[PDB]
Amino acid sequence: SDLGKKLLEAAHAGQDDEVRILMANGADVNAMDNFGVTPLHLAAYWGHFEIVEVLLKYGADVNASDATGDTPLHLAAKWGYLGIVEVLLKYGADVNAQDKFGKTAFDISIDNGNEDLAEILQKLN
């Protein structure tokens, strides 16, 4: 709870070592705030590749949907974070999951101009 909240903040802030310390001390890697947002959601949205990696290594739900329907793959695709998208897929992220508007990661990447990522996602099912 207390550590979960600090892990959410450190994952958002991109503080690699703080994330590792909080995890070693027992912060739930699947902690949720009131929006159902998890550290993996925040690390993906804010572009923290190394934090995404370590969270997934220790059991972060790659397919967690927050209270609004967003998955980590949705959030990374908004910004065209190809490295993060690749490791999400490697851990079993569902390319076909839809957000609250019915959009997949592919749709989302186009909606924010990241058509380099759209081209890679288009080859996937």
Next chain:
Amino acid sequence: IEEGKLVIWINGDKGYNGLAEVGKKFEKDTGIKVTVEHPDKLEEKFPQVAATGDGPDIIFWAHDRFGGYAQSGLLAEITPAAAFQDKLYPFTWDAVRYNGKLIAYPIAVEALSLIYNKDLLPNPPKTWEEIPALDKELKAKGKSALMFNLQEPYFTWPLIAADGGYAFKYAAGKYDIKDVGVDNAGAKAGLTFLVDLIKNKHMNADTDYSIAEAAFNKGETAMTINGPWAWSNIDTSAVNYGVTVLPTFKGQPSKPFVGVLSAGINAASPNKELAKEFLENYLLTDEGLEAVNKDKPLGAVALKSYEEELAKDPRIAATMENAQKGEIMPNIPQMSAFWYAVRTAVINAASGRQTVDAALAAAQTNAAAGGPVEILPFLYLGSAYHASRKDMLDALGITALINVSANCPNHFEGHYQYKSIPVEDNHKADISSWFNEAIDFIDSIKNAGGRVFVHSQAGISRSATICLAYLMRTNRVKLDEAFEFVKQRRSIISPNFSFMGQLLQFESQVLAHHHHH
């Protein structure tokens, strides 16, 4: 009041000395003394002293309060000539119409605009949708894109109403008090986008008015959302700022509320003809408004000729443009329910306590019909209908219900703790023998950090009786004081006479040994 003189009330954040200056010119021309005062909380003092038959001859305030004043007969009807009305934009006269009658003179037009830091952002965004990407860039430089007051719905409404939200529907010269537009698709879309900004960390749900103003005026955030009343503090900060049209959402203009600063004539004034001459021939002139505007800016103004001069300033052109794309604040008394309902919905959605759909569904009913009432921060009162509305219970933070009935179902077991008090609403029911058990349950939930919703079938007799008993016992007060307290908040309470008897007997039991201290 006093004959042959004019007394004017206007808020302290307005150009009251410019106004006083217009009064002096009136006094010089006519011999009629004009006195301008700015009492603290004058919008509350006015309905009290004016019902007496005193107070000012003229009161300046945003038009939305004036519908309530007019309901209580506190404002004189005005009948300006069409040749005079044509000096002002037609929509400003609409804002001062109540029951088909004009009840004030429009003065100024107030709407929120986008205020941006030209040094951090020479080209402000045209759309809301691009603000997340902008915040990504600015966060990389230790700044943020946007901070504004998330505690008051007045400030979030422009986004919520953009795609189709509205307060009360206006048709055929009248507001339909049952047609509220807070839970339609447009309102849901706008609040959903606001929540996305917060849950993704572009904004903080705890940002209030002071926090946002300080951050903008210190160069920490590229944008804020605020009105002309804020320009002076920014001028002092020496931030190089612009004021522009609000971003669009789904290609639709942001739709801010529009307030028309207006001058109403006290129905009790003995100087109504004098007040009209002052307002029509002295204040509502280029020179009169210029005198007031010099003191503290009015923003945009209702007088066409002077608005065309002022609009050369792009901050004022932007104020008027945002007002053209906005929504006149309804002037009906039901707006008090609207403001409370939507304030709760936005705070709950911004904190994640409720989904967007549930938050707006509850606010819709609260604004258009009614809802459970707060007695104490942990104690709420209402009907069996309310006990079937999970969205309305969650909106209040309910964690437990006392079902004071023999027949009413428990709809949400496993979401809330339930306590049954199985009595009928009749003269034979012994409700006082349940008082201690009910009070102990309320306190138990209270001390565990919860909140109790007490209900019966109608929420007027059995459940009101339990709340009254709680108040008398906890605060050591008499029935008459507790009853007045609850009646003030839920005016339809009416415990049956036998329950009133049992409460009066409880009162002497609660207070039997009180006289010693």
